[PDB]
Amino acid sequence: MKIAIASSGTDLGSEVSRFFGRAPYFMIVEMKKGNIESSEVIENPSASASGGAGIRTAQIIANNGVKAVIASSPGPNAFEVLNELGIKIYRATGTSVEENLKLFTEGNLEEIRSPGSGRGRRRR
């Protein structure tokens, strides 16, 4: 279970920045026993040059094991793929990264998912 805070700046000034679209600063938080065991931050490579990018960084967020993605992208665009992926989507109403961390440990924020193995209806 890894919690990833979109934007979140790089220190303690960018409180969630604003929205999640091309934020070249996705903070990664590998929580283990309710105690952040690793707090790092990865910046985007060329968010202002490649063709059709920004929300494409999501594919990479899933390759990092980020089972949690708290962001505030404007529209179901990002939440659309994160859903077809199978990861836990999260919404960032707006508050701060420091508080967001302890906020995920209490399941305060909201999350959305999309299971594909429900209602067992086998033919036989």
Residue ranges per structural domain of the chain:
1-124
- The residues facing 40 across adjacent strands are 28
For residue 106, what is the DSSP state? T
Residue 90 CB burial class (10 angstroms; 0-12, 13-18, ≥19): buried
Residue 78 sits at the vertex; the CA angle it makes with 44 and 39, to the nearest 5 degrees, is 45
In the chain, the largest separation of any two C-alpha atoms, in whole Å, equals 60
- The structure was resolved experimentally with NMR
Tokens for 77? 């665009």
Residue 50, sorted as left (phi over 0), alpha (psi -120 to 50) or beta, turns out to be beta
Say how many CA atoms lie within 13 Å of 88 toward its Cβ: 16
Instruction: For residue 89, give the 3-state DSSP assignment.
Output: strand
Distance of alpha carbon 54 from alpha carbon 38, whole angstroms: 25
According to CATH, the superfamily of the domain at 1-124 is: Dinitrogenase iron-molybdenum cofactor biosynthesis domain (3.30.420.130)
Tokens for 105? 């440990």
Distance of alpha carbon 81 from alpha carbon 104, whole angstroms: 21
* Element at 58 (helix H, strand E): helix 57-63
The span from the first CA to the last CA of the chain, in angstroms, equals: 37
Distance of alpha carbon 120 from alpha carbon 44, whole angstroms: 42
